[PDB]
């Protein structure tokens, strides 16, 4: 504070007090001027020291308001993200096989573990070594889960394409050896 | 923190009181010196504390920013410090088998696969010229990594098998010299 009502009173009080001190009139003049400048600094104390809690509290409030606004924007952002994800993953399951197996239930309830088994259009097989490959995904087509699948594309642990003519018993020690087969459901 | 202005005041009145305690004087002029020193030890005992704390505040801020700078600059040079440290430690280790392969790689003879430990398994090494072949190869034996191997085949850069007898000083400029020797451990 520099331009509040107490300042003018205090300043003029001490100016007149010290002008009269330069005059040097009495002994009660000193007492009176010092009492005035004791009670006028008792005005510049409340008005210049406790006036400053108001500003600090207002700044507390302003920072809290800023924080609340930011926290309110983040919620809308994450809500939009979640509902976009839900709607984008919805656009793949609304097929005609799902409707079939749901209309074959007696209440509309089915176990979840059978939904990929009877409706998924693509299958992925992970093979550790050659004997397991020879027992499961042999040739161009194979049978699994009461269905028949046809192979397209084989990769290795480095994600590099392997041809079906390289997977032999002699060339086995030269392959990165988890193999990942991708197959499509045959009609 | 004596370089502050108010010190000159605090000494001044204190000096007066010194004279007072030397004089043995009346009662009121000592009230004078107990009313203009407690205003000095109050107008100064406030300036000489906040500044003293500010000095340490500046010091701690400078140390924090220096810590940040050095940590930022340390993780931008890992790929060179690590290799320098590795080769310093290898030099200090002082092993014959490691020194052999390090010096051979320094000259140009480098392997093409992992060096095997079993008495079986195949080794393939590159040979860039004839001097290394002469001080490394002798007949049908190969001295590498402080071990002895027997030669099985020599080739040149165009993947064409070369028999061992023709490799010599005069026939040297007739072969693609980056030779590739295949051997097996004794």
């Amino acid at each position: 504070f520099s331009s509040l009502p107490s300042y003018a009173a205090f300043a003029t009080a001490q100016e007149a007090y010290e002008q009269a001190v330069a005059n040097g009139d009495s002994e009660v003049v000193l007492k009176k001027l010092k009492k005035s400048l004791n009670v006028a600094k008792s005005e510049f104390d409340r008005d210049a020291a406790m006036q400053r809690k108001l500003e600090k509290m207002a700044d507390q409030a302003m920072t809290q308001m800023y924080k609340q606004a930011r926290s309110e924007d983040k919620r809308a952002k994450v809500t939009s993200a979640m509902q976009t994800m839900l709607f984008t993953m919805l656009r793949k399951l609304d097929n005609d096989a799902l409707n079939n197996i749901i209309n074959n239930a007696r209440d509309g309830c089915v176990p979840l573990n059978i939904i990929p088994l009877t409706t998924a259009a693509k299958l992925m097989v992970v093979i550790p070594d050659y004997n397991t490959y020879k027992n499961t995904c042999d040739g161009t087509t194979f049978t699994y889960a009461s269905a028949l699948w046809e192979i397209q594309q084989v990769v290795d642990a480095d994600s590099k394409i392997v041809q079906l003519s390289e997977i032999s018993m002699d060339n086995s020690p030269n392959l990165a050896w988890p193999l990942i087969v991708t197959a499509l459901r045959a009609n | 923190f004596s370089s502050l202005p108010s010190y000159a005041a605090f000494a001044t009145a204190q000096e007066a009181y010194e004279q007072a305690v030397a004089n043995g004087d009346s009662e009121v002029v000592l009230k004078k010196l107990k009313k203009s020193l407690n205003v000095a030890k109050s107008e100064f005992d406030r300036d000489a504390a906040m500044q003293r704390k500010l000095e340490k505040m500046a010091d701690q801020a400078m140390t924090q920013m220096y810590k940040q700078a050095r940590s930022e600059d340390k993780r931008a040079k890992v790929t060179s410090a690590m290799q320098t440290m590795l080769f310093t430690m290898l030099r200090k280790l002082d092993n014959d088998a490691l020194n052999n392969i390090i010096n051979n790689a320094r000259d140009g003879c480098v392997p093409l696969n992992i060096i095997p430990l079993t008495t079986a398994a195949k080794l393939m090494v590159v040979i860039p010229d004839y001097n290394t072949y002469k001080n490394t190869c002798d007949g049908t034996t190969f001295t590498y990594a402080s071990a002895l191997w027997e030669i099985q085949q020599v080739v040149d850069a165009d993947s064409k098998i070369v028999q061992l007898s023709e490799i010599s000083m005069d026939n040297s400029p007739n072969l693609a010299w980056p030779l590739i020797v295949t051997a097996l451990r004794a």
């Binding site: - | 505040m57 220096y66 700078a69």
Partner: protein
């Protein structure tokens, strides 16, 4: 962080508003920022007030507010001015010698490299400062060259002849053989790989790199590089050898290079060759002649 250019003392500050953000020491940077209009400095963190959505970017008005730098109306009860004493608060505030003559770097920074005195200072200044002037030249030309228009061809008139169309707000620069255009071919995903070409008025005549088909909608733009700082000066502090070092003369004399035998010794004992050679005086014949001075 490291040593500065003009001062060679370790520092941690930049001119934010200046061109190529050089290293500058406490008093060093203070002179550079108070003598001219660059009034934004970057320490390990930038010198801005973190007040939510505030504006100021000056250096002499922001203050210290504990952990961060704050604005005047934003600053806490008691502060410590960041820019006083003739220094800006930063690393290594003691070991800083500074400088008085700062008109050189100030002129080099505030200049636009448009007139003759620009290059007069660019050469006649300090060699490190002239390397900096070189990089400033490159940056200025890069920034001014992409500021021109984009060549959006829409027609197909002939081969080596087409029609040009350019956008609003950017003029079309001089279609000269001095500055090569650069184009990219459109597709649904990206647009890349037509090469560097040279256009001029015709109808628009184009000078193409290699024969291909001229599609529709391809843009031709004066693209820019990502120019990098320099390390070594223009040339080395020079020397005359006492011996023919790392070299030994030849044994014979060459017919086409008999006219330059007096030119063999004179530089074999120093680094540089200050050439005064007019176009077509055997300008390049010595490039193959002095080459076989010693084929090793």
């Amino acid at each position: 962080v490291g040593a500065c250019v003009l001062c060679n003392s370790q520092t941690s500050l930049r001119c934010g508003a200046c061109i190529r953000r050089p290293f500058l020491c406490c008093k060093c940077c203070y002179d550079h920022v108070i003598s001219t209009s660059h009034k934004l400095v970057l320490s390990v963190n930038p010198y801005v007030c973190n007040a939510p959505g505030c504006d100021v970017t000056d250096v002499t008005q922001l203050y210290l507010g504990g952990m961060s730098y704050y604005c005047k109306s934003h600053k806490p009860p008691i502060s410590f001015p960041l820019c006083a004493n003739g220094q800006v608060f930063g690393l290594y505030k003691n070991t800083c010698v500074g400088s008085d003559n700062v008109t050189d770097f100030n002129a080099i920074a505030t200049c636009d490299w448009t007139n003759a005195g620009d290059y007069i200072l660019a050469n006649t200044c300090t060699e490190r400062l002239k390397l900096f002037a070189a990089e400033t030249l490159k940056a200025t030309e890069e920034t001014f060259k992409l500021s021109y228009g984009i060549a959006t061809v829409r027609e197909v008139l002939s081969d080596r002849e087409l029609h040009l169309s350019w956008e609003v707000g950017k003029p079309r620069p001089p279609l000269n053989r001095n500055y090569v255009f650069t184009g990219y071919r459109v597709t649904k995903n990206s647009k890349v790989q037509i090469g560097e070409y040279t256009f001029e008025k015709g109808a628009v005549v184009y000078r193409g790199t290699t024969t291909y088909k001229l599609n529709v909608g391809d843009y031709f733009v004066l693209t820019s590089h990502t120019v990098m700082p320099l390390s070594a000066p223009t040339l080395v502090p020079q020397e005359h050898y006492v011996r023919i070092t790392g070299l030994y003369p030849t044994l014979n004399i060459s017919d086409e290079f008999s006219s330059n035998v007096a030119n063999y010794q004179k530089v074999g004992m120093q680094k540089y060759s200050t050439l005064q050679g007019p176009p077509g005086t055997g300008k390049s014949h010595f490039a193959i002649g002095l080459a076989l001075y010693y084929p090793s």
